Amino acid sequence: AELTPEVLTVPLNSEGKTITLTEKQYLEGKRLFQYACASCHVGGITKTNPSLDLRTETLALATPPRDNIEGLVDYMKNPTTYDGEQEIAEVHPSLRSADIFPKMRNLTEKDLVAIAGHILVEPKILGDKWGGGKVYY
């Protein structure tokens, strides 16, 4: 019933290779999420745009695909509308918009990866809840 490797054996890229995270990282994921996210993304639900969540399934239908890490990393650096036609850097946190989202200024590649990991491991634990807040709604 403990946290297992499989649990952390998350998809890394579109094709089919995977990486298995560690204990140390996982935790940094939360700590970071809470740091520049939670406020707007509490429990994995957009407060500013409720019709768009962070559940795994909804991320795969994005453009470009986002059910894996490389995609999220790309997003955190530069943003992409659910379809991929607008540059929302002047609106959403982005390493490219540090100057406006000071919380981002400090961040590093290692941290993005972990943050991404937190978002992909959570659902395996929380299930429906992390989605639209079941226990929470």
Binding site: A1, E2, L3, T4, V7, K47, P50, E122, I125, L126, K129, V135, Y137
Partner: protein, 333 residues
């Protein structure tokens, strides 16, 4: 010359009451509230609490029974503004936007405040101490807290606290669904102050009654009282202090009458002192505790703590309070 003859009147005993400088405002004020209020409850027309165009009518004539409700809060449009009569147009209007509410409230607080002053001032004309002024201060402060501070902290008198029995209940419910009070020490000490007073007002009067002067003109067919002229007073305090002391332990019992009656006025007053604060503190959003999650890092499986089933109820209610008056996802006030 006349001016002197008037003051003397106001200042001493008038064979009915004492109406000092404080009751010079208290008497005409609390009257306007009474009258207005009695009539508002017997005929006021519906009033739309939240600006929405859905009037609620909690008056006798408009289909209510006593518990069903009364004088409803001002509109949420006029919500925080000053809504006098002159300031509006026809009374048909006024009556719809909750006028009676403000009018009644404000006069009542002011005169409520003065009813307190009056209490002290009588002390000054009778050479006694100034304490009763202080013990009243607890509820008064509380009324203000509920009728003022909150609507002042929240942004509109609407949802102050309805002047009906039923709405009292509503205010309560909505309230803990919005700020979660149950789990706030100030309302916890509140229940302490009150359940306190109950346990003590029963304890005292109970003992005071058990240790009476068993032999003073009391037979089995008659029971007649004491009067100040009565020296030894009614009871044998040694019997009571002996009783209580033997029920738990020596310290537990109270030696003298000061520590006894001081306790009786200390527990309740300082309990509500806090509660009245409780509300005033949650008037500016410093809501009670909320231990929503305890986990099993094993997998992170969330374990529900008794408190979550409390949030499960607090939840259902949030969802439906002020149905259809919300256009955006999260309430912020």
């Amino acid at each position: 010359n006349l001016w002197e003859r008037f003051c003397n009147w106001v200042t001493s005993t008038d064979n009915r009451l004492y109406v000092g400088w404080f009751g010079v405002i208290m008497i005409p004020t609390l009257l306007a509230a009474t009258i207005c209020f009695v009539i508002a409850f017997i005929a006021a027309p519906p009033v739309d609490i939240d600006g929405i165009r859905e009037p609620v009518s909690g008056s006798l004539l408009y289909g209510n029974n006593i518990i069903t409700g009364a004088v409803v809060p001002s509109s949420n449009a006029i919500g925080l503004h000053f809504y006098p009569i002159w300031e509006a147009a026809s009374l048909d209007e006024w009556l719809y936007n909750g006028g009676p509410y403000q009018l009644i409230i404000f006069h009542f607080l002011l005169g409520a405040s003065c009813y307190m002053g009056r209490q002290w001032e009588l002390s000054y004309r009778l050479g006694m101490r100034p304490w009763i002024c202080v013990a009243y201060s607890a509820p008064l402060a509380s009324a203000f807290a509920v009728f003022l501070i909150y609507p002042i902290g929240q942004g509109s008198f609407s949802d102050g606290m309805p002047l009906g029995i039923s709405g009292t209940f509503n205010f309560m419910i909505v309230f803990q669904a919005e700020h979660n009070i149950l789990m706030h020490p100030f309302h916890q000490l509140g229940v302490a102050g009150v359940f306190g007073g109950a346990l003590f007002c029963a304890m005292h009067g109970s003992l005071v009654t058990s240790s009476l002067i068993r032999e003073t003109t009391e037979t089995e067919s008659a029971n007649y009282g004491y009067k100040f002229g009565q020296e030894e007073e009614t009871y044998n305090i040694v019997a009571a202090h002996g009783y209580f002391g033997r029920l738990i332990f020596q310290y537990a019992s109270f030696n003298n009458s000061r520590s006894l009656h001081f306790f009786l006025a200390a527990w309740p007053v300082v309990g509500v002192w806090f509660t009245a604060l409780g509300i005033s503190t949650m008037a500016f959003n410093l809501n009670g505790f909320n231990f929503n999650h305890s986990v099993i890092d094993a997998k992170g499986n969330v374990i529900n703590t008794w408190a979550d089933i409390i949030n499960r109820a607090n939840l259902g209610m949030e969802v439906m309070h002020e149905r259809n008056a919300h256009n955006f996802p999260l309430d912020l006030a």
